[PDB]
């Protein structure tokens, strides 16, 4: 089997991407944030505290003929941005882009933090990291990908995120029309439960490539590119007037600037992030200070190749017995 679904930016900045997901019988379509940095499929639901729902579409298990309470199971998750959610669990039929999994754990939110309530465009998350990170207790559950894997034509999914445009998540096949050149594969460590890999270095604009090992995670659920302070300082030093603002919470730059590109290494291959991808616009409405898309990972404890980096590539998440990542230009 295979699946193929379009993923759409939630706003003009590409702050996140939503993908329609069918849950239950008859289908209830929710728009979920596919997150390769976590391993829970959780939704706004009929059980979510009413004051914490503001425009999201909800899953109502009582209206699904295939829903079953997973008796005694609970979940509770905290993300890198300080957001959180928790609740109980149903199993139900879940389809993505024509690929169906029966008996998928659908984590029904009873509580969500303010950042989730305030984002009306995101109806929940679909985690695509390793199932070792799934928070369901006392019986840990499998991700949609892990449950689909055995049925897929190839044990892979691919992320093809757009810049200010829709893109695609495919399951079970590699669309050879969706990228240019060849795919470079690189090793993955699953020790922390992430798609963790080591970049071979970086360049700023037209500058020379610096060969240096940068361990980090491929995380579709993180907007920005978070790298070591040395790397980030070297980037922003090439932008007149850029500075790190403790008041704003990262590097800002004059909105009048033209940003340089950023290159990262994948083995001997190179992925170029155009400068425009690094512009996250005014810090507040009407400001002439703009927020940067490359930020320091200092204090986060991991480097994160978020959407800013991933959207510059066609990315293969190879879930074979020995997992690997692949990157291609596009």
Domain range holding 138? Answer: 5-174
User: 124, 171, 125, 169: which is closest to 146 by C-alpha?
Assistant: 171
Give φ, ψ of 234 to 5 degrees: -60, -40
Q: How many domains does the chain have?
A: 2
Same domain as 261, residue 185: yes
Query: β-strand 269-273 against 3-9: which pairing, if any?
Result: unpaired
Same domain as 154, residue 18: yes
- 3-state DSSP assignment of residue 115: helix
CA 262 vs CA 168, 195, 208: distances in Å: 23, 21, 11
Neighbour-count burial of 238, counting CB atoms closer than 10 A to its CB (0-12 exposed, 13-18 middle, 19+ buried): middle
Domain boundary pick from 147, 174, 201: 174
Which residues, in sequence order, are bridge partners of residue 42?
A: 107, 125
The pair of three-digit structure tokens given for residue 251, joined into one six-digit string? 């590097």
Buried b (16+ CB within 10 A) or exposed e, 23-35: bbeeebebbbbbb
CB 212 within 8 A of CB 239: no
CB 207 within 8 A of CB 262: no
Q: Spell out the residues 6+ positions from residue 274 whose beta carbon is closer than 8 angstroms to its own.
A: 163, 261, 312
- 3-state DSSP assignment of residue 276: helix
Distance CA 138, CA 122 (A): 27
Buried b (16+ CB within 10 A) or exposed e, 261-299: bbbbbbeebbbebebebbbbeebeeeeebbbbbbbbbee
Which residues, in sequence order, are bridge partners of residue 243?
A: 252
Same domain as 31, residue 60: yes
Distance CA 16, CA 223 (A): 6
Count of CA atoms in the C-beta half-sphere (13 A) of 107:
30
Same domain as 231, residue 148: no
Euclidean distance between the first and final Cα of the chain, in Å? 25
CB 162 within 8 A of CB 312: no
Residue 199 bears catalytic tag: yes
The residue from 39, 199, 261, 297 that is catalytic is: 199
Distance CA 95, CA 192 (A): 28
Way the structure was solved: X-ray
Distance CA 147, CA 170 (A): 15
Same domain as 203, residue 100: no
The pair of three-digit structure tokens given for residue 5, joined into one six-digit string? 């679904």
- 3-state DSSP assignment of residue 155: coil
CA 237 vs CA 230, 246, 268, 279: distances in Å: 11, 17, 26, 15
CA 89 vs CA 37, 71, 132, 308: distances in Å: 20, 8, 17, 33
Distance CA 82, CA 60 (A): 27
Please state, as a whole number, how many other Cβ atoms lie within 10 Å of the Cβ of residue 109. 27
User: 120, 136, 121: which is closest to 85 by C-alpha?
Assistant: 136
The residue from 35, 146, 160, 279 that is catalytic is: 35
Same domain as 88, residue 216: no
Distance CA 129, CA 320 (A): 14
Same domain as 182, residue 80: no
Q: Spell out the residues 6+ positions from residue 286 whose beta carbon is closer than 8 angstroms to its own.
A: none
Domain boundary pick from 154, 174, 194: 174
Residue by residue, DSSP assigns 1-49 as --EEEEEEESSTT---EEEEEEETTTTEEEEEEEETT---EEE-BTTS-
Same domain as 184, residue 163: no
What's CA 235's distance to the chain center, in Å? 23
Helix (H) or strand (E) holding 233: helix 229-236
CATH number for the domain spanning 246: value is 2.40.70.10
Same domain as 99, residue 58: yes
Distance CA 33, CA 18 (A): 5
Distance CA 250, CA 278 (A): 13
Residue 95 bears catalytic tag: no
CB 329 within 8 A of CB 179: yes
Domain boundary pick from 150, 174, 198: 174
Neighbour-count burial of 198, counting CB atoms closer than 10 A to its CB (0-12 exposed, 13-18 middle, 19+ buried): middle
């Amino acid at each position: 089997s295979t699946g193929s679904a379009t993923t759409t930016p939630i706003d003009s900045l590409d702050d996140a991407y939503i993908t329609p997901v069918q849950i239950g019988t008859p289908a209830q379509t929710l728009n979920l944030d596919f997150d390769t940095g976590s391993s829970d499929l959780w939704v706004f639901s009929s059980e979510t505290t009413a004051s914490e729902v503001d425009g999201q579409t909800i899953y109502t298990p009582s209206k699904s003929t295939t829903a079953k309470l997973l008796s005694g199971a609970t979940w509770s998750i905290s993300y890198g941005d300080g957001s959180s959610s928790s609740g109980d669990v149903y199993t139900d039929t879940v389809s993505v882009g024509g690929l169906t999994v029966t008996g998928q754990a659908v984590e029904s939110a009873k509580k969500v933090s303010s950042s989730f309530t305030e984002d009306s465009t995101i109806d929940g998350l679909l985690g695509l990291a390793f199932s070792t990170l799934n928070t369901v207790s006392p019986t840990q559950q499998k991700t949609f990908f892990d449950n689909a894997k055995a049925s897929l034509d190839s044990p892979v999914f691919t992320a093809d995120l757009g810049y200010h445009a829709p893109g695609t998540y495919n399951f079970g096949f590699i669309d050879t029309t969706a990228y240019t050149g060849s795919i470079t594969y690189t090793a993955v460590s699953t020790k922390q439960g992430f798609w963790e890999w080591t970049s071979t270095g970086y360049a700023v604009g037209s500058g020379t490539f610096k060969s240096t090992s940068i361990d980090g995670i491929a995380d579709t659920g993180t907007t920005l590119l978070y790298l070591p302070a040395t790397v980030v300082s070297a980037y922003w030093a090439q932008v007149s007037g850029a500075k790190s603002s403790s008041s704003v919470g990262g590097y800002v730059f004059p909105c009048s600037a033209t940003l340089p590109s950023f290159t990262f290494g994948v083995g001997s291959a190179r992925i170029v992030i155009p400068g425009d991808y690094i512009d996250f616009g005014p810090i507040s409405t009407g400001s002439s200070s703009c927020f940067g898309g490359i930020q320091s990972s200092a204090g986060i404890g991991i480097n994160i190749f978020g959407d800013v980096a991933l959207k510059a590539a066609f990315v293969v998440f190879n879930g074979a017995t020995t997992p690997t990542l692949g990157f291609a230009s596009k």
